[model samples]
Target: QPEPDMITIFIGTWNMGNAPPPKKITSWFLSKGQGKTRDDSADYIPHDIYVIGTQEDPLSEKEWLEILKHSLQEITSVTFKTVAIHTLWNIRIVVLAKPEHENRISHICTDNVKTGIANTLGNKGAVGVSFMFNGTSLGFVNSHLTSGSEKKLRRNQNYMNILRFLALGDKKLSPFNITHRFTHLFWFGDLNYRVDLPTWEAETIIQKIKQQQYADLLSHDQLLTERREQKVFLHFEEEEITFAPTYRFERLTRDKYAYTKQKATGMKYNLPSWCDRVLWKSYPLVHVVCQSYGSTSDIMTSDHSPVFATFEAGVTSQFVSKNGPGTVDSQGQIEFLRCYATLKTKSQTKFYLEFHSSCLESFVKSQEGENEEGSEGELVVKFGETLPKLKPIISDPEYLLDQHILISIKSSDSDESYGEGCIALRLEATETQLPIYTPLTHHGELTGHFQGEIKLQTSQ
Candidate 1:
């Protein structure tokens, strides 16, 4: 049997320029809320489950890799077997993977790609490297698009170029084939696209690719409706808190010169806006649980609060069959099918009668004291104790001839001896004759009809 396919992709963008000193990062392990409260003499390490973007004083790619390694070790249990770093213009792309699932990745590519859209200023945009999960053959693209151009045309063009490179038109790279395989493409970073625009002109250029039978995991529809419904907060009731205000402009803060100012604004300064975003194609969602998305009050980390999200890659389903009950068996399987078939039938009375008869027969046969031949049990009549009182109400043509037939049957004898010799007759009876029991205490006087002797069994 083929395994069910599901995977979760966590996309986040963190500006960690104001991160606390190396020793203090562990204290913020699962805590959220921002502000720069501490300073580190050494470079800050990256958390194991996150892909961080820190604005350092122009460090080499090698130094950045070392920082990422140190940070990851402090946060997660797994160790990285390999690391690849690529730089295009000023942006950097770091690729890291677990050893066991390393084979799922096919190729990694990065650089500026030429496209049909005119590059007006002769400025070719560079994209981040693609990280593919080898197990699911999913692609994760991390890139920070060009920011700070006031002109709408220039900004739109930059986005269009990024989309073109991702789709197929990158001059330095091979086009992705979507039809051949299941792909989850994630494009996230400081895209700098404003959320207020009704229609981003740049989005038009990549409309085909966006609509191409792929699910946008971070699309507005996927977000919890209640969160969207509440205008001010992304409140998680379970956590009893809100994860909002993920970004803060450094210049707007009071502590302009302080390194921790930006990171602290996310928590302490209370500037609210969801500027940074993570977008992805739908396939890798099974193992992904959206933990939290917010910034710390500490401004020591960076100007932009890190957008953190975590994901696990695995399958989830309703049924997990092992070697126990519900395992496929010929006899049990047939009975299962029969039970369902009978349940679906429209004639409830007929179905109930048939079912009850079969159940009663089985119950009697399974009893320990009963003799199959009806002769060995203590009985007044020969072969009476174990014989079942069989009544075929529907099977008889004479019974069917009478339209008034109510079709009622009852066991005539309670004692073991009369079991086999009891008459199996079906008669039409009124509600008054139906056996509805009422318990009564027998003191010296009898309160009701006493038609037969009651047989009571006593245990020694």
Candidate 2:
């Protein structure tokens, strides 16, 4: 039901069990405790996308996302920032935009994979982002799975390793994977689905959902029996939750639902679950429009209680007024800060890449291994063998990337595209064949055997 200006997402999810969001956390960040008339009070309606996901309990996902980005710009006169922030073991995800669609939000990428035992355990799997919102091409995942109820097939193979996750530090430079190369996506966290009944028979369906009888306990939901046996989010479209059961709450007794354990304290209560959620999907010609979903026992900082929704994603009005920003060449613009690239070897078999730009140091000339020419490079990155978890090298991307450049992969004609044991990492430049930012999608699904191509030369 969008299509007229589209793009209006708020999507929230939480598991702040390590507690730390109260400095007056925007009235639980725009939920002021949700709906009491006035069109269902999910408050703060100034959306243009503000994805928020936080999982676990220990503190510091960058000081809890910089104290909610300075309490959302000092409690809003409305002007938002920050475009991406990720974490794996503490399971976190952050994305914000709304400065007129924030320069059409660059083609960024991210990845965090974990399938628990023997997939390199990082608690559980999922941490993703693949951008380009106006000209479309989206992907946003925030996961935390594989928790008891006997590991529901290891949470359906941990959503198939987040749909074969690849945020490319160069996976052959881009074959588009972030679970189906996003035309639309939103998967929430703490996906610890359960309540397939029989834990004291699910406390009589939370006493029949406080008597509002939510369809007799959502058909004994175990994520609706693994999505009607397709084994998890196969068609994805959750919105009919008459609200309640946001899991085992018990902040020492205030946000009650799943715990009042008094059988002389032998502890076995904990049986009420939605385990937090919010889902969405839209691909062929796009058009998703949920508008609202539930959960908000007034956020007691987490024994688990926080889930939100408000969507619209409805493309094609020529991508809502012809895909605004990008084509900026009054003399500068080349963005992709911390391109999330990883790969290194430069001597005897030669190899080079050290990209981290937000506004390219005055169009770039910061050399150490020096290589120059049309010198303004970043966005031709590829590297994969896996080694994530070092996030602390922020040398500024001018408030985090929108334009900055300094380039070279030394190929005024040939540097052997830096060969030997190669799998992927292309920043090409043999006599300026410079046109590479490959995440390829415009006609979709692998085209002409593909290879990097995206060009620019803004000499401002």
Candidate 3:
């Protein structure tokens, strides 16, 4: 069978230079933001998810977070919610995901590690969040390491410090060490890696980058060269950088240090580098396809240009065959297409339903009795009772829920005799019924009204 369409994610890092988010994102995203004509290099659609890391932002986490929520919506015409926000000192990480995927984001966790002045200050380090994306475990890290052309080793140790210290949750909710914990890990932010080339040499290359010659420059990029030599981020993969140097830019144009920064600050030895970057690594079962990696040429509020990358991480839809429940009980479980949810007793809600077996994928598949060839199991919740409009969920198990997950379905009164998704679900007595629920096929199709008992509880 063909794979399902990949979910798009937009993740980026910006130094912000202690300023507000780039106001020009409005023109860039909503008001025909694409650059000049014949620029076929960018992805036009708003991504399914947006993960942003900021360094030296003066606003509070709440303030900056709201700033993002408002800005993104203003730019894209889509209401994006902030799922997770973490900050330490001037560095912060915010993840804004589509409302449809809210329930799919679970086990949201975060931690911070300082590599600043005393190796214990927030001014430097990373704030990261790891969560389950559909069925894939994803880790997003936003870091600002020690800066200096001579501080390369310090930067590498800063990474190790983050991996060793930053944690998602407490013991029960505790997260895995970065490299070991996530199926896919994304590290971005002011990584502070510089070009080994001399200031003028880097400038010469920038001219070449403008002329569309980009590959040979990698030989001198500190980040890529270190990786190949096994000195840092060994197994991680980075896409070819089609964009120009994201750092040390001239304020007005895309040119590097084109006399604008030099005369203003008079800082010497200032050279262009790909200091802001997006890179990733994946475990065996998962795959990631990077769509585009570049710096936003417009919106150059900071001397540092914002670097963005879009990707489609391969994940099995819970509705597919061989997929199973995340929060399994001793008896059975209920699943949803978009597993992330917000309970809205007062607001209108929509969620599909599923009756999933507690059995393993292998065992469930072997059964010819209660289990369908591609199904998990079956269940009953509120039917005909207008619960939030629901979409049934069916994805493979990538991370098991804690023993704390609320189990919605119980052991079938008669496992030997079962209907498709037909189970007696008590319409939650508290709410009134509208549209009806019934025995949905394994796919949540084959729907119709049938009399059955229901258990009153939230299934989302």
Candidate 4:
């Protein structure tokens, strides 16, 4: 039996509404995002990674970091090392890992993109941190999108703006797409999307919420509508809302929404919304199982309740070379094959070649090549490690006819393959034979291109 390597991740997001942190906030760090009970102490399992994002953060990085670190330690009885932290005005992101994982993490870096007024201010933007953990690349982006219940179009624009501008890693390095570069990505924050119902009509929705029928209100959720239309957060997955909306709460109150009346107009304002959220995207190979998704109502210092999710994320335990050790030919027929590829973007970050019965080494470029100016593209030269020799293990002609070299293209670092194609092998060959170029298609779409040159030799 085989089991994939897995790591537990705890992701939390909060829109503090510009309020200060409470003195006792341990409930926010608990496994279920609720205050502890004597009988439930056995369920508080510590996670390997902790990522927290804050919108309208009240304190500076120093004070807030201390408070978070202390609370996490107090709750989990585990010491965590701050891996990376970044802030863009009122928006902040913090990543922490267990001490045992310190040695496995590398390439830690931070980045930010401002989508505020004129796209120059940091008030509405995203802060990010990316790194490699146990041979897998991971990115955490905490953002504060444009607010206002009617600003759905602006929120969509903010998402696209962040995707275009946010670049992680060293300043001198070529910009890499965080969404496609990282094997696993967690994008969470105060997205500011609201329930579609008007303020005056929210009373009915609130009554439905009070009766504990969430599906009715969720049907009118603006975020769900936009995602359904592919207008924003495309391909991202969020846990179903089993709990009520986390926004529009009254400060220092429990279970009370800030449905206040306008003094000038004598009209109700502030419809409760699921503004704070945690969503994620990952490559196919990286398995992600979300165990829990809910909000913490016990700590009510801020107007917006904090939302958290726990995930068991998969990691690749081994790396096989794309080019490899070849087996000796016991028979007269032997395959001498070569392949090279020109991939666009840093998209080659985690693709591979396959030959015979083994998985070829990863297609990731060397460190030197990555630092080069043209390194964004990767070329697989046939003369190098990209060459492989094969011998027909079975003597039958059917086996030889059935044999073929397979090429697969993975999505970023994930196992989810988007491109696949094969080259048929023949019993004979010549050195002067022209190389063959083939299109790797998935679902009738051309996802990649493959060039292959091969020479088959019979013993003289």
Each candidate's number of clashing pairs is: 41, 20, 38, 7
Q: Return the top candidate by TM-score.
A: 4
Residues 336-392, candidate 3, lDDT per residue (tens digit)?
221211111121222332222222331121111121121222222233333232112
Q: If the candidates were sorted by their lDDT against the true structure, best first, what order would they fall in?
A: 4, 3, 2, 1
Provide the overall lDDT of each model, using Cα atoms, as 2-decimal numbers.
0.32, 0.55, 0.56, 0.67
Q: In angstroms, give how far residue 293 of model 3 lies from its true place.
A: 0.7
Stretches of candidate 3 off by over 4 Å are 1-5, 26-45, 116-122, 169-176, 200-206, 256-268, 317-460
* lDDT score of residue 415 within candidate 2: 38
In model 1, the worst 10-residue window by lDDT is 333-342
Which candidate, 3 or 4, would have the higher TM-score against the true structure? Answer: 4
Alpha-carbon deviation at 68 in model 4, angstroms:
1.3
User: Cα RMSD (Å) per model?
Assistant: 25.6, 17.9, 16.7, 11.1
Model 4 clash count equals 7
Deviating ranges (above 4 Å) for candidate 4: 1-4, 33-44, 119-122, 169-176, 261-268, 318-460
User: Can you give the lDDT of residue 381 in candidate 3?
Assistant: 28
Best lDDT among the predictions, by candidate number: 4
Q: Against the hidden reference, what TM-scores do the models get?
A: 0.42, 0.31, 0.63, 0.69
Model 4, position 70: C-alpha lDDT score: 89
Please identify which of the two predictions, 1 or 3, would achieve the higher lDDT against the true structure.
3
